Design a protein around this ligand. Structure first.
Ligand SMILES: [K+]
Ligand SMILES: [K+]
Ligand SMILES: [Zn+2]
Ligand SMILES: [Zn+2]
Ligand SMILES: [Zn+2]
Ligand SMILES: [Zn+2]
Lengths: 402, 406
């Protein structure tokens, strides 16, 4: 099947998402070619999760769907901030597609939290277009495999990138990458699925040590320009230099990205099929990086809650570890016992390792999570809950087989 | 007074221009602070040329216009190509403004080739906003002054950047930069106005030697990702990495950018108040770099016309171009009518060329008919002719005087 439509290369597409809270738009930045296809070769027309946006590639001749994938984005977060009620802003976003033999139509769609299409772009890619930038042939960033279970066609390729490390302190970065990798494969189900993964540490250099702190007026020259005070939230570390992130990796096989920042301050986050970014020298580095990978690889939701609006109570979330009980049969109903009370009182929690516990996806009321505590709820707790474990296991099997 | 409203710093604003042939929009990308204001300190509310887009800065308190500038853009040329009927694309663009003391409203407007508004963005810049990225303090790209006629507040600052030169090739770059400076100041009016200019050469390194040649499938890792075949025109050498060009220059006072490409392949490009790009090692390096600076500094139009060219049709025949060296005879009184002798026929027959160094010659602006140029030949039409025509010279002189006074 795969070779009916694709060569063993990557069509990398860089998009800009732009707009404000009332109107959003997608445009094309650049088309690139990478030397191998590291993604999947089966289930090419299906998705593992809905995401908040989707890309669908169709063969122009037949109209068949030949590849699809889904994601979330930082842009869709910025859309909730107060700056989005005032000015129109733009964000870089990058997707890897298998490289087609014949012309292919690519359609990318963003959805809002009511699941309405908020932006859409359909465009034809001609595989012999001379303006497709060929990348990853020379000057490949120095890197080392931490775990090499197989070739990139059969294993899930995870790249760990360096932010705020100079060339002359990569020893520290490779140590931090190993710690992150060890933390990840001490959690089930990653632990028993360890031979499905390749982990490569990529020593992308920065001119300065550390990351930028705008509030202190301390701006640094780093590989990806990460900075605190994102959206004027003091503690929120991000980078928006997505083209620079992917250029650092060109020529190295990769499907998922973890970025490690050389700093002890708390900060970071993960976004489904975008990347994880986290600080490597904070005391909670080990549980936090795994929690972020739960978002960025697992597509899981946050299970903690306050006393909101992101998850409308009349829609079933696409994330697998929270429910509004609108279509609970598609979630973890089948993992409950025939008598588990719905909702599950915290008094009887010892009785119900899996239940339907009120509180999750930031709301105390109307959203429910699968267990009382979980890596997706708190750093102190030692494991993913059984529902998150099944969710992650299903992602792994979608890409590497039962 | 300038210091009524501005400090001696630069507010750099990066925008994204996005759209297709049907619809366009502007969004803000990033605000930056550079350590000195290298631009003008008088005529702050007037424009030397209309351009295809305008920026207007207003004090929020009083509504008063405190700075303005204009430009063209690669995006606005792209909009006239066939690709813009098939996809929506986005482009980086950077503008330097004086850094305000008190909050200011910035209005950026794009106009189409009928000189009507096609996109608009207004936004407020607060001078104490913490996400204004402070640049130009450390890691300043290595550089050498080739000409230093005065400080950056008195003179026009031109930066020449290196593209496709590795660290080991920078002696060659500095030699090429000196050839370009020499070529520039061998054309009038630059020659006589040389003491109004500072020229700095900036040794920005590339990992690979040479530049990308897409038609030949040979891509190169360079500082600014320049490439031939822009809009599928073989000789059109440009970059879309406008943030990277301006980042390389952070901390060096500049107003205009010339980029030298380490290549023998023929090509160049020039866009008003954005940048010039040129091949450094082709035999026509000297006339080309000056030709492209005619676009990027002078805002001049091309005076040539080819049958099979990507740019044909950029100028509608019922609109007077804003560029000073072509006319459609829609508002010729604003152009060079006041330099014609009273008996010059309009249009001027090519047979009578000997008799009229200045006339109204049919052919220019990428159209054989309906657009007219001021002289039979000019730097803006061919590489073999030696000088700018007299209308181009006056146009350039007026730009120099706008910035540095009569
Ligand atoms: K793989
Ligand atoms: K100046
Ligand atoms: Zn989280
Ligand atoms: Zn869980
Ligand atoms: Zn030209
Ligand atoms: Zn001329």
């Amino acid at each position: 099947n795969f070779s009916d439509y694709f060569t063993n290369k990557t069509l990398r597409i860089d998009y800009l998402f732009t707009g404000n809270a009332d109107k959003q738009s997608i445009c094309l930045d650049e088309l690139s070619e990478l030397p191998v296809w590291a993604g999947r070769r089966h289930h090419l027309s299906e998705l593992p999760l809905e995401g908040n946006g989707q890309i669908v590639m169709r063969d122009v001749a037949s109209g068949k769907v030949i590849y699809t994938t889904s994601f979330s984005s930082l842009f869709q977060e910025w859309l909730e901030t107060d700056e989005a009620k005032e000015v129109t802003k733009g964000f870089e976003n990058t997707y890897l597609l298998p490289y087609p033999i014949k012309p292919a139509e690519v359609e990318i769609t963003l959805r809002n939290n009511k699941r309405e299409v908020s932006a859409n772009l359909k465009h034809v890619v001609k595989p012999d277009d001379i303006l497709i930038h060929k990348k990853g042939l020379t000057h490949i960033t120095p890197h080392k495999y931490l775990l090499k279970s197989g070739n990139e066609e059969q294993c899930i390729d995870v790249a760990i990138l360096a932010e705020g490390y100079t060339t002359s302190e990569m020893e520290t970065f490779y140590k931090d990458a190993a710690i992150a990798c060890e933390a990840l494969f001490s959690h089930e189900p990653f632990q028993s699925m360890k031979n499905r993964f390749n982990i490569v540490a990529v020593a992308s250099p920065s001119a300065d040590s550390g990351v930028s702190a705008p509030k202190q007026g301390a701006w640094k020259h780093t590989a990806f320009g990460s900075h605190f005070d994102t959206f004027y939230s003091d503690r929120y570390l991000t980078t928006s230099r997505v083209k620079a992130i992917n250029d650092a990796l060109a020529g190295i096989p990769y499907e998922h990205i973890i970025i490690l920042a050389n700093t002890e301050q708390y900060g970071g986050g993960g976004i489904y099929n975008a990347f994880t970014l986290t600080t490597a020298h904070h005391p909670n580095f080990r549980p936090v990086v795994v929690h972020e990978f739960g978002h960025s690889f697992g597509g899981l939701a946050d299970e903690y809650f306050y006393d909101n609006g992101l998850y409308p109570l009349n829609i079933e979330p696409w994330e697998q570890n929270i429910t509004t009980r609108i279509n609970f049969a598609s979630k973890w109903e089948d993992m409950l016992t025939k008598t588990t009370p719905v909702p599950t009182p915290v008094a009887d929690k010892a009785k119900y390792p899996i239940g339907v516990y009120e509180g999750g996806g930031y709301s105390a009321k109307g959203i429910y999570r699968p267990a009382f505590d979980c890596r997706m709820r708190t750093n102190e707790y030692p494991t993913f809950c059984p529902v998150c474990q099944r969710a992650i296991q299903r992602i792994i099997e979608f890409y590497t087989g039962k």
